[PDB]
Amino acid sequence: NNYDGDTVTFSPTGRLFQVEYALEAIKQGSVTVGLRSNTHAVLVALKRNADELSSYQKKIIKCDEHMGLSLAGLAPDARVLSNYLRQQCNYSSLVFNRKLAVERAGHLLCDKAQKNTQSYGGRPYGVGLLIIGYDKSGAHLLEFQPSGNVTELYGTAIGARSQGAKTYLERTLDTFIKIDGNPDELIKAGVEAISQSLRDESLTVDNLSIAIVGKDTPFTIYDGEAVAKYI
Amino acid sequence: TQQPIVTGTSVISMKYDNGVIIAADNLGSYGSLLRFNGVERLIPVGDNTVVGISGDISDMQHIERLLKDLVTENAYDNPLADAEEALEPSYIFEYLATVMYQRRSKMNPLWNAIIVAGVQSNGDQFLRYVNLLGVTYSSPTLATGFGAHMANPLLRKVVDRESDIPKTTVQVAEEAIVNAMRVLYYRDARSSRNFSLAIIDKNTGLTFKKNLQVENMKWDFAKDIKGYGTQKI
Amino acid sequence: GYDRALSIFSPDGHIFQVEYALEAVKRGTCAVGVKGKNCVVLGCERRSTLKLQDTRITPSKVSKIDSHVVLSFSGLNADSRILIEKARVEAQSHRLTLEDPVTVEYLTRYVAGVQQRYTQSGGVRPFGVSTLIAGFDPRDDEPKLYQTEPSGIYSSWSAQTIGRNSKTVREFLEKNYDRKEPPATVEECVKLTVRSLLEVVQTGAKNIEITVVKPDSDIVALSSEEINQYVTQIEQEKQE
Amino acid sequence: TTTLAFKFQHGVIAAVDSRASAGSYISALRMNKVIEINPYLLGTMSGCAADCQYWERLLAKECRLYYLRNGERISVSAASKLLSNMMCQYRGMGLSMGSMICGWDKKGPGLYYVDEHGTRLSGNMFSTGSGNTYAYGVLDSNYKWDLSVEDALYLGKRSILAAAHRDAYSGGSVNLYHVTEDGWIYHGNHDVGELFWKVKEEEGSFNNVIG
Amino acid sequence: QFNPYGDNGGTILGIAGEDFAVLAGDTRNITDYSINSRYEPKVFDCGDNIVMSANGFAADGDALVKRFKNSVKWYHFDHNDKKLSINSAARNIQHLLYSRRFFPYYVYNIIAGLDEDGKGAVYSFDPVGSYQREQCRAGGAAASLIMPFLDNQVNFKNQYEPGTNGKVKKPLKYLSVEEVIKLVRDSFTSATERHIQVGDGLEILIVTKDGVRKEFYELKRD
Amino acid sequence: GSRRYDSRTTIFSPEGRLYQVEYALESISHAGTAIGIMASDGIVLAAERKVTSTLLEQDTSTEKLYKLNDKIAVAVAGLTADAEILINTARIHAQNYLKTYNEDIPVEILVRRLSDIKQGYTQHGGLRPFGVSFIYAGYDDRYGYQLYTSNPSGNYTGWKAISVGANTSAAQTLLQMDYKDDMKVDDAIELALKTLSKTTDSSALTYDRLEFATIRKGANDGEVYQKIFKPQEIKDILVKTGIT
Amino acid sequence: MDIILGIRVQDSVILASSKAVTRGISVLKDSDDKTRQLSPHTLMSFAGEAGDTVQFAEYIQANIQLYSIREDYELSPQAVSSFVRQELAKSIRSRRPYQVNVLIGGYDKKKNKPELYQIDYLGTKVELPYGAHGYSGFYTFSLLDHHYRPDMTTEEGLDLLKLCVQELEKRMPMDFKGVIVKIVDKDGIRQVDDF
Amino acid sequence: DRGVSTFSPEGRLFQVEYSLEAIKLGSTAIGIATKEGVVLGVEKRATSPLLESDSIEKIVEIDRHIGCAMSGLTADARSMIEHARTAAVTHNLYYDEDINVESLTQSVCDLALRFGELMSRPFGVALLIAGHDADDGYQLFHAEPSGTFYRYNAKAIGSGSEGAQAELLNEWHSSLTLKEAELLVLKILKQVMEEKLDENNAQLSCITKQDGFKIYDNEKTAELIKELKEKEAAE
């Protein structure tokens, strides 16, 4: 009300409204799902178009051979944060000959987003990210919020109507975690999960976007007729 | 640009079937003066890596601190710091190599020659060299300074190529290293009798031996040598 | 440094500071530009509220940017000096790096770019000035006349006016100026420029300034008596 | 190297050799010492090969940007000046670059000499490199404004040959160019080994040499 | 006074075929009169069917290769996983080298691969960035020993057809990969005999439309 | 943050005016009147000190008339402290010009420079403008005797006769009436004092409430002399013209 | 470059400047004009290190042309010479000084007098009736000391200048390829096409 | 007052949303992509008859293979065009090749959100970026001040955008020829424009693989306008 003019102002109940408004931009964004087993980690994203003449906005971005994310909210902010991850992943390789741990990648994103929430002049990031990766401690899935909060999960979903997919994964927890050495079945579970967030529209060939990473599988994105198999 | 003041001489090393060995004497020379006699030039990093350093001692102490700080920093927000995400020899080496090459590119080098010896997660042996120029290389045997000229020839008789590594035992490799250190004591004017030796094995882990001495030396034949040509008495 | 964003969008999609800069131009004295077949003429109003003025030393309304290009304006006088200085520096800078004098189009594009920069830079306000830039390109006999404004947009004009009561003199020019056959001579071009100002000026004494620019760096400013003869001839024909 | 370029009635000729040296060692037999900046602009190279390639390709970037901003091709005079100004920024920093900017613009054919000192000279005829003295000898005694395209191409070709023969750091092959108002025209790569024997027989020159 | 440069010896060799290319180099690393390693790889697969070797001062050579490999990675990120053509890679490397015009990478660089028409390509550089596409190039310590041999046996220089007596040249027939590898092995065997910095081992990287293949051959260790 | 407390000194009103410049001019209108009159053989500068005291040391006091160099002087109307900042800058600029070209600075060039500084404070920096209006009286070999004025907007204009400060409307009317082109310095002195005597808000115009100065070619042969009048000299010229 | 001469007569200033330009052992050009018009009645000739000369001259030219446009007024030769001196005096203590010597010939329209200023690369200014830079003065000043009068005509000034060039051509080892002569007077600047 | 980079309660940046309102006031620009090329057309909209219409430059060349049309505060586009031209030629310097249309568009869109308290406000102009490359063929992009860019088969921006976009919805198909696209742009421009469409107040352009980016002459466009009138009168 009087305490939402900038990011440097607490409300009387201890809330940061500019951060909460940035969080709102994520809810307006299109749905994206993340889930993993012990061997592989999968991203599934519902892409959004402007109209029938327009293309479908890309949702998934590659960060390294072993790491990448999906976005929901302001796309340009995701480009900034993914670029930062690309640099950090790359700094780890060039200096230490070491693939960046997914957990440490989350810590770096948290700290970058935090600086924007405590200083005058700037603004919080208006995007949520789901980071997947495979490192020395196996498969991983992270959820990033622009408040700074990063959380490691078995599965999750963000965006509009994301609660439906999140409930499904909460039921299926014991099943999909055990899908080891079977990428196609893990993707099936992700496609079935994101389907719980759909209304009116359904999954078409240029609508669906999938990405996967695993033990002997580099981070690769599937679009177009490559995802027709899973429709 | 500087000049080295207090210096440490040769560091020698080799691979064997289950790991690596590295050794270096305990002397800190001040030109021709054998000033400091209790200097440790082998510095362990965790229980899987030993960094051996020759050259300027003040720059060595600086590197020693960088490595100590590296271990501290790797443990930050890392539940697997004593397991999967522990520091590897390859990580430690590449860090140092990055530092050495950056410093030479600013014309303010760390006046050292470094050998990083260790065993990786998968049990593979690691042995790589780096120096003040940022020059790096790997070989079954590695040595700095005088050791390059006198020790390598002896160690290459045991492991002449890669295929000789599985055939070489730890007893044979340690014996060869100890003999090489004796030869250096005979012939290197900036060397000492006292030295340290480290073994990193993929089964038995890190064994760090201190206060070793060169023994079984041959001097008796000196009594018979008289004059510089014609003198008989 | 002072970084405050003064020029910003409003809910209806307007930048008020840029629009209020146009109001400063509306307040400024009237300036007019007319291009003939082989010349361009720049006319300027001088408000007669200020008498006891020393016309020798008072800053003239038309300014030479180079030997072949001139610039007149309407709006804040102090603001115009900054644009003129920058323009003059760029003109010499272009000769120094490219070995050719600026084209009229290039000089206009530079001045317009400066004006635009001051609409999306922190800690600064827009120039309260619109300019008429006229001249002839090197080794070219085709006349050039451009207009700029605070927002930074520019365009070429057969004839144009800016400043106070510019709506009236533009109305006059729109019906009197024929594109198929423009003022063939210097006389016809000046006469049309004086006629257009007489719709607004008040008295035709020291209130009208005229500057004729011809090809090959031939620029001259008319005197009071020379202009007064045009004023006399126009009204004598009007009495009929 | 030996490079030359001269203006004449039917435009401008540009001829260069193709040798590169690293001491007494011939590091390259066939190097390109002409750069096609645009279809009406050429640039010769003499000095540090790296400097010549980098700065003349950076000139082409800047000449291309000129066309986009102004909707018109850059003049030879302006192009040469941009290059001379680049040289003045790295004044005394150790660059080694001698070049001729050849082309056709509104003023007709244009030719400017530019070097690492920032020197910029307009003229009808220039020759740079370790063998320029040998080339000047042939050019000065045979040049006319009234030269035919066929005779002019041969002159530049024959002038490089003269230098390639005597100068130890010039040779390999001859690259010919002819600039017209429709643009430049490449007139081929000519091996000096073969060209020498051919010219010797047909012209009767190089009598001292046995073949 | 501190000398930031050094010489690690070695020699490299690039030859372009009709539909293939090779990039070879010895595996010996040296300082002065000592041997550092008998097997220290010098020619690398940089991705996108491109191979590269920077010969001279190993520290600068490793940094350049490392930087180019990085440039390839960022080219994929920035331009939708587009393949970096050999000509585009060459131009990119020129700018990496000239970034240090006043503190040079002390290396002679060579890359090899296939052009966009599927034909074999070799590009050669000097330490400060001048580059050019070539058919044949030897670089490094024994470059002056090998290049004349290649002029003779690859481009058939000074060779004429018998009976004509210097009137008709030997025609420029292309070489097969098997014939090229022979010239490479004989080049390095000869260089090993007469140059002290050359020896120990030989590693050849062959590039075809099918990918990058390796071949290793021993050399004299004296 | 800090934005909350920013007055925004460099913005346009909806009507296209600069708020702070207009309010600065309002400040200046309450300042003591200063008059400048240009004649064929010299220039006069006259100015009124504001409600003085008997205990003010007049002979060592200077609030209105300042010397920029040997050829140029200024009369001040507004905040004296603001004026001194600008005056010292102008003094430096004149010396920079003399050092560079080895010639005394032309009057207009000095005036333009000061006016450009004032302009800057209205367009950028977020600071308040200088609440000062100058009358420049000067001489050079190009245009001869010159009068200029500048105000907080940074706009400057040339004049034959002009007033700044209080009652300029009334003062300008009186000057416009009695001024003629063939006028001389001695006549201009009389006009300046008569105009102040009629426009003044004080009961009577006296020597202790005035500062006066002339720039004359009335110096031995082809050269110019600046005369800052002393208290006793102002008293004498008041008796001579028949005011006291 | 090599030789630049100057002489101030009754009603004009005459500047003579060599035409040669040399790189290495080769004379690249024999028609080079070592001068720039600073204003309609002010001409500056120059000589010094390669490249620096033209860059400096064009930089000065731009600054004076900028002044002329701003004030709609031509600076006096004295004012221009002082501006140039300061730029050179500023330059000599820079990281890399501009190694340029100049002569400034101008006609003062106010005083109706010709004026010649000699300024070296250090910023050493002197007003003279005749001047030169480098070794040129060693050969020519003896002739000028003998023959010069202040009431000389332009034609007499050219004849005395021819004698100076002939002496240079006889006793100098270097071939400077003749001179381009320019005259500065009340009517402006013109070139003597036959010399 | 309030921050320039402030979020609204709905989760949108106020200034970005307000700049979109400025773009709605701008003159109409239309783009249509086909397999034979991409066509770009604009409404000039001269404020007075004395204004020489040929000086209105709302269609612009970025490279030989990339063109651009604009709508909104057109003065803001000049720095964007300058950056685009620099980016296109710089990539040619570094990589000896043409730059991808998408990569060029991304470089322009990176400038968009570089505003705060960098420039003081977002751009008040939208761009239609049309071009061709070997990888993805003929392409049309819509670059906004939000930093977002969508690829389009056909797109209209400016004051008559929603009406024109609805018309483009029905008319566009994947087998359109270049000539058909030209007439289609002219048809829709004529529909949404206030004044009567002619060669002086409307401009056409196209980009083909062979000839590259070309702005159409007024004589060439005039014939296409006459060809349009006759085919509409044909039924």
Ligand SMILES: *[C@@](C)(CO)[C@](*)(O)[C@H](Cc1ccccc1)NC(=O)[C@H](Cc1ccc(OC)cc1)NC(=O)[C@@H](C)NC(=O)C1=CC2=CCC=CC2=C1C
């Ligand atoms: C004459 C041959 C003079 O020697 C020419 O001037 C020639 C000009 C030139 C050649 C190629 C491309 C453009 C222009 N210049 C040289 O060959 C030049 C001579 C030289 C050497 C050193 C300096 O430093 C003061 C200046 C000029 N040589 C080189 O630049 C040398 C360093 N180039 C190479 O050695 C070289 C090796 C090589 C391998 C593969 C591709 C390119 C290579 C080059 C340029």
Ligand SMILES: [Mg+2]
């Ligand atoms: Mg040996």
Ligand SMILES: [Mg+2]
């Ligand atoms: Mg001197």
